[PDB]
Write a protein that binds this ligand. Structure first.
Ligand code: 09M
Ligand code: CL
Length: 410
């Protein structure tokens, strides 16, 4: 594998008793000791020495024990083929980020030169669209559905090029394909094992990278979790983004990238000149807890959380059924925390949200946000079952429905 091709010139030009130590004196920091309790788990303690560790600078790719525990999990969950490959051949490498957004952004940054082609299915994450836009890439939209990206659409799109063209600079082959394989923001649609095989196979034929942005992986209502692109990455073409935001803490800013050693190493260098490293305090906070828990301790917690949002999914749907009677259309969310609604008989919905819905104390995101062309009208809504109560959901839909009707009288 040649990683140099997928890389931007600036990325490749990146570069890595002691008085050398450009670190401040630890004994000069005000916060002396910490005690953090955990429900259905033990108690975390940050003693004098542990606190001095937590308050001082850290490795950059992450704290050693957080990186080891995560490495163990990535193998124990995806057993990536790349595990024992030579580094140059795309050997599996991990990297702790200050949220999964840091991982993705840095990856996009290290890949995209203005003019480069990117494969992505619309509607896609606002944050990533927002990331790629200033970057200068051409987003080629790949046709999706309830089961995700249609391998056939990707198959048709790729037919523009020849499988040899990937080797040829002068031929602008797609640098990567971007997907949310489980519970896509904003649709909530998840891919299938079959389709993923077809897509990976397509990635091989046309030789492009796959950035697997999977934050709602642990939040699968599916029962037996579907195998990942990383879990099937023979070549070493997968950059996989995991998040602790949806299960452990969004505020702590601790995410984790898993991909080929050369590519991960390219992001690590960028973070060296950007944030230096993620909060050593929070990395230790996560580490210590999920260490004393174990993989069983972790999997119990994940199950506990999936069955909360399962009822939240059940709840919002039990509401949509009641109030969106036949005023809109929706797919049962596969995973994650979003319900994606198609308001029947209306071209644009943005108006009757930030002007009609808000004044009614109900607010949910218009679909416009999830498209490259934000100007073009959307009859879509993205409703979050992450927080609102069944009562709240009921009171929310009863409003929304009212508004759907008024605009139907125009
Ligand atoms: C697919 C995908 N990739 C990356 C991220 C960010 O990952 P993180 O850093 O691990 O939390 C996200 C989080 N998505 C959202 C976050 C959010 C935060 C504040 C306010 C609104 C937010 N809305 O709207 C979101 O959808 C995501 O959906
Ligand atoms: Cl071309």
């Amino acid at each position: 594998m040649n990683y140099a091709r997928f890389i931007t010139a600036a990325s490749a030009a990146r570069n890595p008793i002691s008085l050398a130590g450009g670190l401040p004196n630890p004994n000069m920091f005000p916060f002396k000791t910490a005690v953090i309790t955990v429900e259905n788990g033990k108690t975390i303690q940050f003693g004098e020495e542990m606190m001095k560790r937590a308050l001082q600078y850290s490795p950059s790719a992450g704290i050693p024990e957080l990186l080891s525990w995560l490495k163990q999990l990535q193998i124990k969950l995806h057993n990536p083929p790349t595990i024992h490959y030579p580094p140059s051949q795309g050997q599996m490498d991990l990297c702790v980020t200050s949220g999964s957004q840091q991982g993705l952004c840095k990856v996009f940054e290290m890949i995209i030169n203005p003019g480069d082609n990117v494969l992505l299915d619309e509607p896609a994450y606002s944050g990533t669209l927002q990331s790629l836009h200033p970057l200068g890439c051409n987003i080629i939209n790949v046709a999706s559905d309830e089961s995700g990206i249609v391998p056939d659409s990707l198959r048709d799109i790729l037919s523009r090029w020849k499988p040899e063209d990937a080797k040829n600079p002068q031929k602008n082959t797609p640098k990567f394909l971007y997907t949310v394989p489980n519970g896509n923001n904003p649709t909530g649609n998840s891919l299938t094992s079959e389709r993923k095989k077809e897509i990976y196979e397509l990635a091989r034929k046309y030789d492009f990278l796959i950035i697997e942005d999977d934050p709602y992986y642990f939040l699968q209502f599916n029962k037996f979790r579907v195998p990942t692109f990383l879990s099937m990455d023979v070549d070493g073409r997968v950059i996989r983004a995991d998040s602790f935001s949806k299960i452990i803490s969004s505020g702590l800013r601790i995410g984790f990238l898993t991909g080929p050693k050369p590519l991960i190493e390219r992001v690590i260098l960028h973070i060296q000149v950007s944030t230096l490293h993620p909060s050593t305090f929070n990395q230790l906070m996560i580490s210590q807890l999920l260490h004393e828990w174990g993989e069983e301790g972790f999997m119990a917690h994940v199950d506990r959380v999936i069955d909360f949002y399962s009822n939240q999914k059940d709840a919002i749907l039990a509401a949509a059924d009641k109030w969106l009677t036949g005023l809109a259309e929706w797919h049962v969310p596969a995973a994650g925390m979003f319900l994606w609604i198609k308001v029947k008989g209306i071209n644009d919905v943005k108006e009757l949200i930030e002007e009609k819905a808000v004044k009614m104390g109900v607010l949910m995101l218009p679909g416009n946000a999830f498209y490259v062309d934000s100007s073009a009208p959307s009859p879509y809504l993205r409703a979050s079952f992450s927080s609102a109560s069944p009562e709240q959901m009921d009171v929310a839909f009863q409003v929304l429905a009212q508004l759907i009707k008024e605009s139907l009288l125009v």
